[PDB]
Structure 1
Amino acid sequence: MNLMITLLTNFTLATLLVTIAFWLPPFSMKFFLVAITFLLFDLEIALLLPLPWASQTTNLNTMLTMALLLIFLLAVSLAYEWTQKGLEW
């Protein structure tokens, strides 16, 4: 409710500013690769990111190996589109 009070105060101040302002007077296919490419790398980011919360376990070799396989798989995908004229124009 602390964040709710801050959100309320900032929203009401924003509405006061906007009411003071306004009450006192064809595409490319090559565009489409960027968004889905971004989103799939953001998905692999979502796979990578629980690592620093995890790094205190006993099975550390398994953690290190699957972390290597995750970054290496992201590298394989990036090198795939790199060699196969993906992010070109």
Structure 2
Amino acid sequence: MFSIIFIALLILLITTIVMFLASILSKKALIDREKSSPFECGFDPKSSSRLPFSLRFFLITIIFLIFDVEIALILPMIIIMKYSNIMIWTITSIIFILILLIGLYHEWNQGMLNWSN
């Protein structure tokens, strides 16, 4: 893991040297007033992109976070099958996946997986 740190620092160093070599060998022309402006398909913007953005999938994002920490408890049981009671392992595993199916199909029934609109 100490070697992975050093090779990650080396990849970061090599990519910074590559980007600085792209910046040094770039054509150096004078900066125009309207060259630097945001594109906005060729016209004036009327609004900055720091304007607040409407979120229609907030429930889907929080359900994604809940389901991801549910992912964090599935990943052990690859290893645990060979070293545990088979009965207890099957009761926990089939009950885990069936509870996830009850939750996902129940929110499919309510329509909470559809975007707000």
Q: TM-score range by the shorter chain?
A: 0.7 to 0.9
Kindly indicate whether residue 15 of structure 2 is the aligned counterpart of residue 14 of structure 1. Answer: yes
Q: TM-score, normalised by structure 1?
A: 0.86
Percent sequence identity is: 34
1:61 to 69, 87, 94: 87
Give the number of the structure whose alpha-carbon radius of gyration is greater.
Answer: 2
Letter in 1 for 2:93: A
Unaligned runs of 5+ in 2: 27-51
1:41 to 67, 76, 84: 67
Match in the other structure for 2:110: 84
Runs of 4+ in 1 over 4 A off after TM superposition: none
Match in the other structure for 1:2: 3
CA RMSD between the two structures: 1.6
SS in 2 for 1:47: coil
Unaligned runs of 5+ in 1: none
> Deviation at 1:29?
4.3
Pairs aligned (count): 89
Q: TM-score, normalised by structure 2?
A: 0.67
Distance of 1:12 and 1:63 partners within structure 2: 47
> Deviation at 1:49?
1.2
